[PDB]
């Protein structure tokens, strides 16, 4: 149980965050410099999005040990060889994705430990702390430990994942079955005046992570792509994953609080303040910090109050397709944003994107704080 | 009555459409080449917008002969002198605006003749034919007649307007009073679920003329700014003003028809087809043609069914502030569109704007054709 999680998730984050610098490294050493890394962040949500959603139906059947760990891992063997020459050739693509793939395993991780929540007063921090912690240190002395962690990433991912496998010895029981007859799709046909209500919260996370996809591009962009800083980009990002998570515990209760939006609101705005605040460090590095913060408590109140109602099918739809969808939108904009960002400097343009989402959450924040009705 | 209109409106369109080429001429001979002419179109809606709206309250008091004709005309004396050196210096600005100012007089023109409508089966073509016709020919042999119509425009505007004055001998009677205590401002607070209804039509003309502001930029842009073609841009645009107007008579009844949107829908889309259709002429020249078409029947069903309900204050708000407002939005985009259109060629970018409004009206078209409820 518990330990099976710690192992599979360990490799999950190891490959995940480590691919952040790894991307930075090889991606800034390939064909499409820095436009691609922004796109890589888009890939982050590509994985998680289709995961929680479609992998949801996949979660209800079988396939954990086989497809999930055994599958993605063997593909990782193809990893360094093909990912050198083909590193450039969309193999920087395959690599990045698979890292977050183990992260998908992490998704299921939050699920079962939630059962453990039913045992007492636990809320979410527990499982997330498990992952978060392993991420921060292991990752830092990983690349930061001895430069290009080629066979090291090979070890971390393979070794930790197969460690899980070797001690997991389980397919996936205690849950339903059939993905082919599970995939959902519906609409606001039933969600009519719910527009006032549901669309209030819709606009919330929808716009939130969407513009945040663009902001993700920014924050994770800054660096000297290989370097200790990028290896430690994996580190720093994770260090902050940890602080905001217990903060997210009380933060879920805060989600109630002036709609956690008050949080997101002021935060993204402050991100911009730091964007033009002090000497290098704090600015965008804090940017990534905040982004993840928002993500967690948001997905917290959303997880429960969303997925348990008939808005289970409609719920999968709201946080997953809606949010992840917005992310995809901004990502596409990025594709042509670079190709059209030719305005050499480019101030107010990308800044309009970043700042937009910040202040966008501002207006949405208070505006939603006002409405309140039961059923 | 009738003749007073024909005179004041005559000068109205003379200065109006003639400023279209005149702009093209001097504007393409000034500081901000061609970005400014696009902006000039934005000025078109600046005038008409604030006119129908705020000039509405102005219409209810007094000021026709004094402020309206006497005022704007004397300002026109300042016209060629200051508008040469200062032509460049925002005097190309003052000139263009004042032309459409006499056009404001035209606004009041559609009003009274509507009373004449109450007399039988008339709908709108009548007054609009008056203006439209005078525009097309007078304008063509105006600039096209003997090149730079300096003192000619002086004559046309001054002479025709003062002709009106000399035979108008009326201030403005048969209507209410007080602008200072007339200016309206309110919101969708009352217009709640009206969102389904009102916002259906809202999106209609809102987006319609907004993107059309950008499209206006395109269509009226093409030319060799002085030239017979531009003088005849005034001509051509007006020639087509005439055809679509009686077409707008039956077109109002068509406004009903699959919501006149079916019209706007297919049309703007076809505008794009011609954009990449045949040899020079037909393309964007047809572009302007269609734009005005849409404008008239739209403002027709809107005029009646809009301005006569409590949505008189709310009505002024919908077609006037809402539509005109959208126009302003696109115009601003234009300001920085040029400054950022530095992508030397610039295909899909401005084309995305043009094409967007076309297809935008497509979706809105059919989508609205479906709803139907009384009260």
Curated annotation (Swiss-Prot), chains A, B:
GO BP term, example: xenobiotic detoxification by transmembrane export across the plasma membrane
The record's Gene Ontology cellular component field reads: plasma membrane
**Which parts pass through the membrane?**
1-21, 39-59, 66-86, 88-108, 127-147, 155-175, 205-225, 235-255, 269-289, 291-311, 322-342, 357-375
Give each disulfide bond as a residue pair. none
| Residues on Cytoplasmic side | 60-65, 109-126, 176-204, 256-268, 312-321
Stretches in topological domain Periplasmic: 22-38, 87, 148-154, 226-234, 290, 343-356
The keyword Coiled coil is assigned to this record: no
- Entry's Gene Ontology molecular function annotations: transmembrane transporter activity; xenobiotic transmembrane transporter activity
Which protein family is it in? Belongs to the major facilitator superfamily.
Gene name for this UniProt entry: emrD
Q: How does it sit in the membrane?
A: Multi-pass membrane protein
Task: Give the keywords, sorted.
Answer: Cell inner membrane, Cell membrane, Membrane, Transmembrane, Transmembrane helix, Transport
Q: Tell me where in or outside the cell this protein is found.
A: Cell inner membrane
Q: What does this protein do?
A: Multidrug resistance pump that participates in a low energy shock adaptive response.
Q: What is this protein called?
A: Multidrug resistance protein D
Q: Is this entry keyworded Cell inner membrane?
A: yes
**Which species expresses this protein natively?**
Escherichia coli (strain K12)
* Entry-linked CDD domains: MFS_MdfA_MDR_like (cd17320)
């Amino acid at each position: 149980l518990l330990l099976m999680l710690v192992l599979l998730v360990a490799v999950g984050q190891m490959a995940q965050t480590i691919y952040i610098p790894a991307i930075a490294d090889m991606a800034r050493d390939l064909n499409v410099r820095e436009g691609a890394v922004q796109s890589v962040m888009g890939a982050y949500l590509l994985t998680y999005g289709v995961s929680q959603l479609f992998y949801g139906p996949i979660s209800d059947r079988v396939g954990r040990r086989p497809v999930i760990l055994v599958g993605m891992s063997i593909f990782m063997l193809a990893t360094l060889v093909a990912v050198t020459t083909s590193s450039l050739t969309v193999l920087i693509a395959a690599s990045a994705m698979q890292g977050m793939g183990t992260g998908v395993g992490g998704v299921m991780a939050r699920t079962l430990p939630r059962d453990l929540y039913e045992r007492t007063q636990l809320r979410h921090a527990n499982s997330l702390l498990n992952m978060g912690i392993l991420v921060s240190p292991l990752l830092a002395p990983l690349i930061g430990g001895l430069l290009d962690t080629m066979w090291n990433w090979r070890a971390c991912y393979l070794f930790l994942l197969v460690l899980c496998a070797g001690v997991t010895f389980s397919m996936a029981r205690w849950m339903p079955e059939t993905r082919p007859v599970d995939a959902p799709r519906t609409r606001l046909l039933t969600s009519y005046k719910t527009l006032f209500g549901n669309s209030g919260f819709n606009c919330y996370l929808l716009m939130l992570i969407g513009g945040l996809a663009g902001i993700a591009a920014f924050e994770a962009c800054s660096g000297v792509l290989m370097g200790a800083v990028l290896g430690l980009s994996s580190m720093t990002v994770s260090i902050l994953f940890i602080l905001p998570i217990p903060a997210a515990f009380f933060g879920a209760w805060f989600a109630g609080r002036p709609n956690k939006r008050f949080s997101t609101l002021m935060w993204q705005s402050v991100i911009c303040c730091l964007l033009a605040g002090l000497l290098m460090w704090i600015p965008d590095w804090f940017g990534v910090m905040n982004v993840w913060t928002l993500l967690v408590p948001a997905a917290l109140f959303f997880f429960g109050a969303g997925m348990l109602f008939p808005l289970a099918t409609s719920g999968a739809m709201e946080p997953f397709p809606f949010l992840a969808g917005t992310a995809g939108a901004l990502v596409g904009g990025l594709q042509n944003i670079g190709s059209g960002v030719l305005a050499s400097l480019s101030a107010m343009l990308p800044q309009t994107g970043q700042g937009s989402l910040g202040l966008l959450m501002t207006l949405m924040g208070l505006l939603i704080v006002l409405c309140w009705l039961p059923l």
